[model samples]
Target: LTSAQQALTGTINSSMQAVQAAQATLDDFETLPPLGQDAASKAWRKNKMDESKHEIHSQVDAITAGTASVVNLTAGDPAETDYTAVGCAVTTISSNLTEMSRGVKLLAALLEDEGGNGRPLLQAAKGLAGAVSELLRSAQPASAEPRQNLLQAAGNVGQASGELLQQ
Candidate 1:
């Protein structure tokens, strides 16, 4: 495999780790009091949630950086049409980054005030995890198109997660 592919795998792994960590945090919250539904308590949870979101953002950034690196490496010739394909890859990555950002925002708000509806957030996270897992599983060196399609689907899942949180 190419170095870029290796880096992508590592970044994907890290993103998965972040998702697991977020889920663990959610489980821990479930065992505690409801924070009394007070504004101050909610604010504190919001802060913590923001921090968790920042963690996810960091992971997404890592993934994007790695993907961009690969694109740049492969697009070595400025005059060639190699950039066209790389551009598609970059677009897939950009879409995911945008969607992931939205998801993080939704998840942060949910964490702050579950509104007695934690199930939605959990379900959204689960969906995100599943999507990411599927993308990782589908990616292979022999089939670039399938891998690109998986990445795009992953982006859609991220958007779905954000929409779930917004609801």
Candidate 2:
């Protein structure tokens, strides 16, 4: 694998692991008894639910911010070559991905039955996935020899979305 591919994969893997960790946290919250929310008081429950989703969204944003610089550095911009900065960014990205995965899963669980709303959120998630895949593809080395591994990694991200859609 090209050096870029290796570096980028490490980043992507870090992201995936973070997302999964977040999903675990979400699962914990999801296992709570259904707030018995089916009446006029359901409005209160809905508000609480929305607040939870909002919190998750905020966490995702924070995570993205943390990773943004590291991602830029990964492109080998010498101006950003501080090793400590890179290390910090990597940590933030990994932590946030884990939390985001959990948050999304929590949002999914909370609204799994709310057809219209959930579908739109799912679409947004899919869009983010697509963009991320594209970013990875852009990072691949383009030189005398084509890097098949980089292409494969990008293709795999797309394939994952396809599989998710099928389910």
Candidate 3:
């Protein structure tokens, strides 16, 4: 209930929204058949798709988990602020952004091979960059500098998994 908490929550919302949105696009991509991948091609493409999807999901989950920790920084008290926890959560998110964005970069490259328009997923990855930006602006008292660099360099990194045969 603290003001800073509220503000940071909004920032967290941005990251969550962007990540979720990116996942939505992924869901769409997953739903449709690979369209003409043959026996020899199917296994290779399918495996790569699994790897790419796994990377995205991994980051998304990390981001989600890291941000949620912010809520626990204070024990439901409007008069307390654990700046350390706040800072730590931001740091954790920074890591999440780093892993996911890199994965996205690779993912876009992979998807492009299949659909020629990985821009949707790649564009969705922009949320992390944007979210981190807002989180920085929101956190004048905040790693931010390099995390941005990370978003720029991008994918050290999921999706839910393995059924990648277009089922």
Candidate 4:
């Protein structure tokens, strides 16, 4: 495999790790007494935790799908046109993961201010977010190289297609 593909594989593995860490944090929260003793505070914390999990899962899905796309693109002799379409799909997934990372980071910030009872889960969330950020950073360069390659391939396909049409 190419270096970029190797990097993407690592990024995908990191993303899966992040998802597992976030899920563990969510599970831990279920056993705790919520962020505060009050019912309203408890409910709020639960809601935020749920939202955070949703974002984390969404990112995981994006990374998983993006990884699959990259693997397929590099598999064998795919057409230039195929790369053009698939590369855009990969870019979109990367952007989606970035947006999800923002949500995870925001959730981490919100969790950080909780009382001592929530400390463990807070730390877990922070770790999860940090892992996700690392994956995102790793993917950026990996995806960029493939995007440039795909763009070139796409241009060639377009020119060829035009010639074929004229013939």
Candidate 5:
């Protein structure tokens, strides 16, 4: 196998760690105390949280699916591998990551103060953000079409991730 492919595998594996950790953090949100003052209100908040979580997870599903696709796209004799296909796949992954970042940000605000419980959710958001920029650095496009998409997506995800990393 090529050295670049080896590095790509490493980055993908490391990214999985970030994704899994973020998911674990999200799971903990389920245990948080209800943010509403009464049963009816709590039900409303629960609905909102579930909706937000669904949005977040769906985008995450996009990322995971794209990752698998890119893996197979490269899973061949190096001579037969096509950079254009791989690059396009990475761009799709970036698009999903960008959308997922927005979902997590929405969840942060939805979670609110709620007795200091929002902190974990925000951390989870940052963790996913980390995955975005990290994976972007690993994937490159051979043509301008896919490369432009990568540029825009990485611009958003990388800047957002850096901003969150500082806090």
Candidate 6:
């Protein structure tokens, strides 16, 4: 892989790991019973949930920033090797980060509810994870035309990702 492609891969991989970690934390929270009625218990529960939210928020920021760097590094010069594919992948990753960030925010808000019904937020997180998985599965092609096709697909995926976050 070219240096740009290598850097892109590292960014994608690290972001994926962050998403996975956030999902696991969310999953664990899903299994717990609702917070107790006492003020102390409620305060403790809120603190714990807020801590997780902060971690996820931090991860999203990192992913967004890293993906932006990838975009800058891959921009211009279509003649560069893996230029189109790397650019597309970075864009797709950025879009996914947006979705994941929205989902985490929604989840945090839901956690504030006394009823603590966050199933929808959990589903949203799972969906984001699935999108990330699909992006990782996509094949990287050597040919310029095939790479162009990948770029188009990535653009479409990113658009869809953005649309989901708008909901």
Give a tens-digit lDDT track for model 1, residues 81-129.
2433543454454345444544554563565456555555555555554
Pairs that collide, model 5: none
Candidate 3 clashes: the total is 12
Q: Which of the predicted structures, 1 or 2, would earn the higher TM-score when compared with the native? A: 2
Which order, best to worst by lDDT? 5, 3, 6, 1, 2, 4
* Most lDDT-accurate candidate: 5
**Least well predicted 10-residue stretch by lDDT in candidate 4:** 158-167
Over 4 Å off, model 6: 1-30, 33-35, 72-113, 138-167
TM-score for each of the candidates: 0.44, 0.51, 0.53, 0.44, 0.53, 0.49
Each candidate: what lDDT?
A: 0.50, 0.49, 0.52, 0.48, 0.55, 0.51
Q: Which pairs of residues have clashing backbones in candidate 1?
A: none
Model 3 whole-model lDDT (C-alpha atoms): 0.52
| Candidate 2 lDDT, 1-167, residue by residue in tens | 25434554566556555544443343333443455646844675477567767765575455455535645564444334454455556566456445545555556556764442454444444444444444333443332324444344444444543443332
Tell me which of candidates 1 and 4 scores higher on lDDT. Answer: 1
| Candidate number with the higher lDDT (2 or 3) | 3
How much lDDT does candidate 2 score?
0.49
Worst lDDT run of 10 residues, candidate 6, spans 137-146
lDDT of model number 4: 0.48
Model 4 CA lDDT for position 20: 49
Q: Which is better, 4 or 5, measured by lDDT?
A: 5
RMSD of candidate 2 to true structure, Å: 7.2
